[PDB]
Amino acid sequence: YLSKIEELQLIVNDKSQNLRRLQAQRNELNAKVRLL
Amino acid sequence: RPANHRQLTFEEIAKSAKITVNEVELLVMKALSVGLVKGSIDEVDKRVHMTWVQPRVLDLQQIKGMKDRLEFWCTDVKSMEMLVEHQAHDILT
Amino acid sequence: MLLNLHKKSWMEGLTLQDYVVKEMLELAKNYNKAVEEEDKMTPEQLAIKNVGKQDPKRHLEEHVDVLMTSNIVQCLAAMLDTVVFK
Amino acid sequence: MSEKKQPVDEDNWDDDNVEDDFSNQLRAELEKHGYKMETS
Amino acid sequence: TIRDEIAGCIEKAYEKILFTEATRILFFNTPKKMTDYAKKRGWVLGPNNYYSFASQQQKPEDTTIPSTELAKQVIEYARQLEMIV
Amino acid sequence: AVQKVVVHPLVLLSVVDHFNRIGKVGNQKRVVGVLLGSWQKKVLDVSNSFAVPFDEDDKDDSVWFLDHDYLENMYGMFKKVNARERIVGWYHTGPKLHKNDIAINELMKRYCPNSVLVIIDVKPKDLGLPTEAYISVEEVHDDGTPTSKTFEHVTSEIGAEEAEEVGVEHLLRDIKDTTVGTLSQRITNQVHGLKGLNSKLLDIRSYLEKVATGKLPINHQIIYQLQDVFNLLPDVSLQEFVKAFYLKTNDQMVVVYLASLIRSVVALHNLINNKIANRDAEKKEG
Amino acid sequence: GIISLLDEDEPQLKEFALHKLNAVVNDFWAEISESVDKIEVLYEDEGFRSRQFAALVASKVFYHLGAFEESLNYALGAGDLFNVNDNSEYVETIIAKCIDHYTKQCVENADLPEGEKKPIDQRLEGIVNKMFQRCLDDHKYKQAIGIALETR
Amino acid sequence: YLHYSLYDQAEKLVSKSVFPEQANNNEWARYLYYTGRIKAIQLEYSEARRTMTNALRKAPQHTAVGFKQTVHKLLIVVELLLGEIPDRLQFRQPSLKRSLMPYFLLTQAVRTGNLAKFNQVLDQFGEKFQADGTYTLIIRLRHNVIKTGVRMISLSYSRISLADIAQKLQLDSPEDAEFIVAKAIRDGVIEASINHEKGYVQSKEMIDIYSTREPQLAFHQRISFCLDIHNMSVKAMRFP
Amino acid sequence: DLYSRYKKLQQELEFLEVQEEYIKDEQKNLKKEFLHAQEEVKRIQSIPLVIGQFL
* SS3 (DSSP) at D9: coil
Count of pairs with CB atoms under 8 A, one residue in B, one in E: 11
Whether chain G has a CB inside 8 Å of the CB on H14: the answer is yes
* SS3 (DSSP) at F167: coil
Side chain identity, residue E15:
E
**Per the CB < 8 Å rule, is G99 touching A2?**
yes
d(CA F115, CA E84): 55
Give how far the C-alpha of residue F45 lies from the chain's centroid of Cα atoms, to the nearest Å: 15
Picking from F49, F29, F154, F40, the residue whose alpha carbon sits closest to that of residue F91 is F49
* C23-27 LR contacts (CB < 8 Å, sep 24+): C24/C70, C24/C74, C25/C74, C25/F254, C25/F255, C25/F258
The dihedral built from the CA positions of residue G27, G28, G30 and G33, taken in this order, carries a sign that is negative
Where helices occur in B1-92 by DSSP H, the ranges are 13-16, 24-34, 59-62, 64-65, 72-87
How does DSSP classify residue B7? Answer: S
How does DSSP classify residue F52? Answer: P
Whether chain E has a CB inside 8 Å of the CB on F248: the answer is yes
* SS3 (DSSP) at B66: helix
Phi, psi of F86 (to 5 degrees): -140, -175
Q: List the Cα angle F103/F107/F112 in 5-degree steps.
A: 135
**Per the CB < 8 Å rule, is E78 touching B91?**
yes
d(CA F1, CA D7): 96
d(CA G57, CA G18): 8
In this complex, which chains have at least 3 CB pairs below 8 Å with chain A? G, I
User: How deeply is E30 buried, as exposed, middle or buried, from its count of CB atoms within 10 A (0-12, 13-18, 19+)?
Assistant: exposed
Whether chain E has a CB inside 8 Å of the CB on C66: the answer is no
Phi, psi of I23 (to 5 degrees): -80, -25
| Residues in chain E within 8 Å Cβ distance of C68 | 81, 85
Q: List Cα–Cα distances, H74 to F129, F193, H48, H49, H132, in angstroms.
A: 73, 61, 12, 12, 8
**Per the CB < 8 Å rule, is F239 touching C25?**
no
Q: How far is I28 from chain A (nearest CA, A)?
A: 10
Side chain identity, residue H46:
S
**Per the CB < 8 Å rule, is A2 touching G150?**
no
Give how far the C-alpha of residue F234 lies from the chain's centroid of Cα atoms, to the nearest Å: 30
Residue of G nearest to I6 (CA): G146
Name the CA dihedral angle for H11, H14, H18, H24, rounded to a multiple of 10 degrees. -20
Resolution (A): 4.2
d(CA A24, CA C70): 30
Method: cryo-EM
Q: Which residue in the set E5, E56, E70 is minimally distant from H193, CB to CB?
A: E56
Where helices occur in chain G by DSSP H, the ranges are 3-6, 14-21, 29-32, 36-43, 51-64, 68-77, 80-83, 89-111, 126-138, 141-150
User: How deeply is H40 buried, as exposed, middle or buried, from its count of CB atoms within 10 A (0-12, 13-18, 19+)?
Assistant: buried
Q: List Cα–Cα distances, D29 to B29, B92, D22, D34, D39, in angstroms.
A: 69, 71, 9, 9, 16
d(CA E42, CA D23): 53
Report the number of secondary-structure helices (H) and strands (E) in chain E. 2, 0
Q: How far is C82 from chain E (nearest CA, A)?
A: 6
Residue of C nearest to E79 (CA): C72
Residue of E81, E83, E84 for testing the chain F interface, max F β-carbons within 10 Å: E81
Residue of H11, H13, H16, H17 for testing the chain G interface, max G β-carbons within 10 Å: H11
Q: Check: CB of residue F5 under 8 Å from CB of residue F44.
A: yes
Residue of B nearest to F202 (CA): B71
Q: How far is F15 from chain H (nearest CA, A)?
A: 52
Where helices occur in chain D by DSSP H, the ranges are 16-21
d(CA F235, CA F233): 6
Q: Check: CB of residue I27 under 8 Å from CB of residue A26.
A: yes
Picking from C85, C83, C76, C84, the residue whose alpha carbon sits closest to that of residue C21 is C76
Q: How many CA atoms lie within 13 A of I39 on its CB side?
A: 9
Whether chain E has a CB inside 8 Å of the CB on B88: the answer is yes
**Residue burial C42-55, b: 16+ Cβ < 10 Å; e: rest:** eeeeeeeeeeeeee
End-to-end Cα distance, chain I: 75
User: How do F86-92 and F116-119 pair as beta strands?
Assistant: parallel
Whether chain F has a CB inside 8 Å of the CB on B34: the answer is no
Residue of E63, E81, E83, E85 for testing the chain C interface, max C β-carbons within 10 Å: E81
Whether chain C has a CB inside 8 Å of the CB on F174: the answer is yes
Q: Check: CB of residue F92 under 8 Å from CB of residue F119.
A: yes
* SS3 (DSSP) at F244: coil
Name the CA dihedral angle for G4, G7, G11, G13, rounded to a multiple of 10 degrees. -30
* Number of residues in chain H: 240
Q: How many CA atoms lie within 13 A of B51 on its CB side?
A: 10
Phi, psi of F229 (to 5 degrees): -65, -30
**Per the CB < 8 Å rule, is F278 touching H236?**
yes
Count of pairs with CB atoms under 8 A, one residue in G, one in I: 8
d(CA H130, CA H121): 13
| Residues in chain A within 8 Å Cβ distance of I17 | 16, 20
Q: List Cα–Cα distances, C36 to C62, D12, F203, in angstroms.
A: 10, 44, 50
